[PDB]
Design a protein around this nucleic acid. Structure first.
Lengths: 179, 58, 123, 145, 142, 60
RNA sequence: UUAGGGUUCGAUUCCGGAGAGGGAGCCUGAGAAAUAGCUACCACUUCUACGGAGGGCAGCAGGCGCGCAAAUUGCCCAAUGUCAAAAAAAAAAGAUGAGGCAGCGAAAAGAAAUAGAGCCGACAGUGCUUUUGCAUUGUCGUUUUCAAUGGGGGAUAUUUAAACCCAUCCAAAAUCGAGUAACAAUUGGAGGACAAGUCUGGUGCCAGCACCCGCGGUAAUUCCAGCUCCAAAAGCGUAUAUUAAUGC
């Protein structure tokens, strides 16, 4: 009684649960990006849906209609920040043209690999979770953090890391007690 | 000490089952005996019993 | 090693309340290199020194919320004028935390039971 | 006997014998075959299995060979029993039946007077010993001499 | 065909209301007496006390004998059959012992090659029967 | 034979499970299976090389 | 739930109404047909020195019965409100099962671990090939090497009404700790529908499986078990109801 906090689903399962084509696609991504489960590959498809949904309802409308101007502008803005698209898109068709990879490729676990701050993909998931990364000066332990276009250059390594400065290791520190 | 060496040499692993034959010949026993299910109950030594919801009251 | 741990302090949005005669604000800290959270006592010191306060007994402060990773924190400060102004205008529990509180009165339960008996008496 | 309760036959001999083993102890029973002593081991096994299967019961052969196998069989039909990953209801051997080893994982064993000896004195097999509870060996009178 | 006027509406309404009594689906749901007839009263499950054990036969294209029991529901004082799932599981079921009873996975109809039986069993006496077939627990005294 | 119930099951040998080494779990597991398919073999499932394959042992 | 038109549910946080064992009648008051007010009857029930006097949880805890089925006979007025002769303070603490904070709680919802980075050995592929190899990629192994971190253990402490959880840290001169990482994932499946075995034992129309079509009579792709493989994963089956599938 009398709590007004809200909760809602993100992911929803696909209909028709055994399909050879689907299972191919899923799997292929799931180890290329090092994703834990199928739950993640569905989670992204969710966002992508609701996005293109609104954008389509807008595209329908006569030009210069109130909702189309307002809402349109803002949708387009935040599909250029989170860098799903170029800044040279503006026609509200490029929105609908998006596919699953564009989303995935901005998740932190991806980005790490590309700026050569980890050797492998599975390596990079580990590395974020066990607390050796930053995104401005703020320490992130979640690999599913979407990275904005403006953020990217700042990622580096954290300095509470052994890989930065301060307070070396667990391995080392235990040995150094024993001796 | 050929327990150990025979253990070694056989874990390269051919072929493949001699594990079967021992239980397979323990079920060669005839038309007789009963097969109670003695099947897992296992617990550490420690137990308790109580009434508890609890009471009646009066 | 190459590190000495230090506490640096600042204060954010700054009122001056003249209705209740205090100065209330929101604390900041940084504390690089500091093992765990900074205690209360140290913060009080740093405050009084900066705002040129007569005592550290005038100072109060409470709440602290650390931040994920790093070390940082914030908190809600108070600086009175005079000791009396504290013990008056302040809650009982905030007093208690500094040892200025009032010693306990009994658990609620006993009071409640007692009061129900003495509805039946006349005298 | 009128009573039938916590043993089937019984009759006289069990209603006495049982009360010793219920406390634990030693003893022996002088008694030519009629009783069919497989009851004793069936009751022992009922205790170490129902309650806290970590303790070893052991049945030791008069000498190797043929009885080893017949006993193995008979035991295994009083009901194989589920566990986690190894575990194992009965291991035998030596021989002349079943043959040398499976040594280790178990609850109840079946070997011979040489096998058991080496398993006892030796300093690395000590682990087993304190969990053996409880050791019976059969037909000593015309086999030991 | 049907009316297509612009003041037609009354017709079209009354029409539909008559012809939702010929759809089978609609009747099962909107009739209140459907529950009354049902042994569980529209509940998921119900408890019962066994009375005997009975082998049931099978319909012709398979010949095998089946194991089944007989149960008396104790909030209705009905009688009804049931079925015993999985191999050798009749020996965890005893007569005059409480038991929980389910449907058989279609609404009031019978799963084939077993005549007249429409009720699966689940528990016996406060433990499962797939906790006794796939035996990770063992039946209480009581 | 109705004078017997539970028949087939008791009559089997009670072989009761080889020891095994533990398998990867989490992201680990999904990495495993990715190698077994999309890497290593260049003729991989389609009809050419089934996911499970058994050597012919039998005449049936 | 859904392209759309619709179908279905709404006891239950907010708003309105009615009720306080069943019925009726009434007093006080600005306001009540008030039941932690009164009077009478009916049903039920308690204490008694038998002369009498009482009770009403569909308030909070907790029982009993019932049923397929639902929590502590906790802590507190600190927060948020109401009542009042009332600010706090002066020795000088108004009440509050409203309400908050904990306990139990895989109803439901979000984030997220159960290993990562290398040597040799071994196989597979590749280019340059004289096919002698060389370069070179991927994969698998031999209990071989390195680094890092949580679960957890503990505080100068912080949190809180007081405690707990979360967050921070393992010295700032000065404070622990993974290798079989035993600190070891499960629940349903593999004839078709529908992703995945022409493998090896057992049974022989029996035992059982099977939502449907079907399988079992000694070469059982379906049963009972091993081994291997597939789907989802800290979750996964089963029943019942309902919506979509249904232009049935």
């Amino acid at each position: 009684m009398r709590n007004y906090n809200n909760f809602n689903r993100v992911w929803k399962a696909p209909r028709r649960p055994f399909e050879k084509e689907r299972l191919d696609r899923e799997m292929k991504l799931c180890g290329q990006y090092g994703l834990r489960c199928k739950r993640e590959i569905w989670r992204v498809n969710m966002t992508l849906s609701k996005m293109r949904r609104t954008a389509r309802l807008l595209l329908t409308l006569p030009e210069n209609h109130p909702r189309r101007q307002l809402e349109g502008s803002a949708i387009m803005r935040r599909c250029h920040d989170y860098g799903f698209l170029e800044e040279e898109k503006d026609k509200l068709d490029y929105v609908l043209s998006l596919t699953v990879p564009d989303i995935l490729e901005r998740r932190l676990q991806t980005v790490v690999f590309k700026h050569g701050l980890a050797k492998s993909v599975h390596h990079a998931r580990v590395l974020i979770l066990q607390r050796h990364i930053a995104v401005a000066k703020q320490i992130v332990t979640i690999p599913s953090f979407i990275v904005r276009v403006s953020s990217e250059h700042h990622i580096a390594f954290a300095d509470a890391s052994p890989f930065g400065n301060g307070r070396p290791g667990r391995v080392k520190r235990v040995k150094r007690k024993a001796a | 000490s050929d327990d150990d060496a025979g253990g070694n040499s056989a874990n390269n692993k051919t072929a493949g089952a001699k594990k079967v034959n021992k239980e397979h010949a323990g079920q060669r026993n005839k038309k007789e005996r009963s097969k109670e299910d003695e099947i897992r109950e296992r617990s550490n030594v420690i137990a308790a019993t109580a009434t508890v919801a609890e009471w009646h009251k009066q | 090693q190459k590190k000495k741990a230090e506490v640096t302090v600042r204060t954010s949005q700054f009122k001056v309340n003249k209705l209740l005669n205090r100065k209330q604000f929101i604390v900041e800290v940084n504390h690089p290199g500091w093992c765990g959270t900074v205690p209360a006592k140290l913060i009080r010191s740093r405050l009084a020194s900066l705002y040129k306060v007569a005592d550290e007994n005038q100072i109060s402060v409470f709440g602290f919320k650390t931040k994920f990773g790093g070390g940082k924190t914030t908190g809600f400060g108070l600086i009175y004028d005079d000791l009396a102004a504290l013990k008056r205008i302040e809650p009982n529990y905030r007093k208690a935390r500094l040892g200025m509180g009032k010693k306990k009165q009994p658990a609620r339960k006993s009071v409640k039971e007692r009061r129900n008996r003495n509805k039946k008496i006349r005298g | 006997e009128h009573d039938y309760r916590v043993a089937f036959n019984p009759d006289n001999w069990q209603r006495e014998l049982l009360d010793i083993v219920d406390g634990r102890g030693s003893a022996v029973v002088c008694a030519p075959t009629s009783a069919g002593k497989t009851f004793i081991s069936y009751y022992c096994m009922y205790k170490a299995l129902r309650r806290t299967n970590k303790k070893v019961v052991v049945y030791l052969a008069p000498a190797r060979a043929l009885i080893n196998q017949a006993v193995a069989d008979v035991c295994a039909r009083y009901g194989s029993k589920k566990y986690k990953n190894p575990g194992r209801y009965i291991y035998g051997a030596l021989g002349g039946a079943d043959y040398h080893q499976f040594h280790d994982s178990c609850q109840v064993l079946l070997t011979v007077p040489e096998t058991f000896e080496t398993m006892l004195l030796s300093p690395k097999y000590t682990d087993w010993v304190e969990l053996i509870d409880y050791v019976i060996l059969d037909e000593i009178h015309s086999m030991e001499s | 065909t049907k009316a297509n006027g612009q003041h037609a509406a009354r017709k079209l309404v009354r029409l539909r209301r008559k012809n939702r009594w010929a759809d089978k689906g609609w009747k099962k749901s909107h009739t209140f007496v459907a529950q009354k007839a049902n042994p569980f009263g529209g509940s998921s499950h119900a408890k019962g006390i066994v009375l005997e054990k009975i082998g049931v036969g099978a319909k012709q294209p398979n010949s095998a004998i089946r194991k089944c029991v007989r149960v008396q529901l104790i909030k209705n004082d009905k009688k009804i059959i049931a079925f015993v799932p999985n191999d050798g599981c009749l020996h965890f079921i005893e007569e005059n012992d409480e038991v929980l009873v389910s449907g058989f996975g279609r609404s009031g109809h019978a799963v084939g090659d077993i005549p007249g039986v429409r009720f699966k069993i689940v528990k016996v006496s406060n433990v499962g029967l797939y906790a006794l077939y796939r035996q990770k627990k063992e039946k209480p005294r009581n | 034979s109705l004078a017997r119930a539970g028949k087939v099951k008791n009559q089997t040998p009670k072989v009761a499970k080889q020891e095994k080494k533990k398998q990867p779990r989490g992201r680990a597991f999904k990495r495993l299976k990715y190698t077994q398919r999309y890497l290593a073999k260049t003729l991989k499932p389609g009809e050419k090389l089934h996911m499970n394959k058994q050597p012919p042992g039998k005449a049936g």
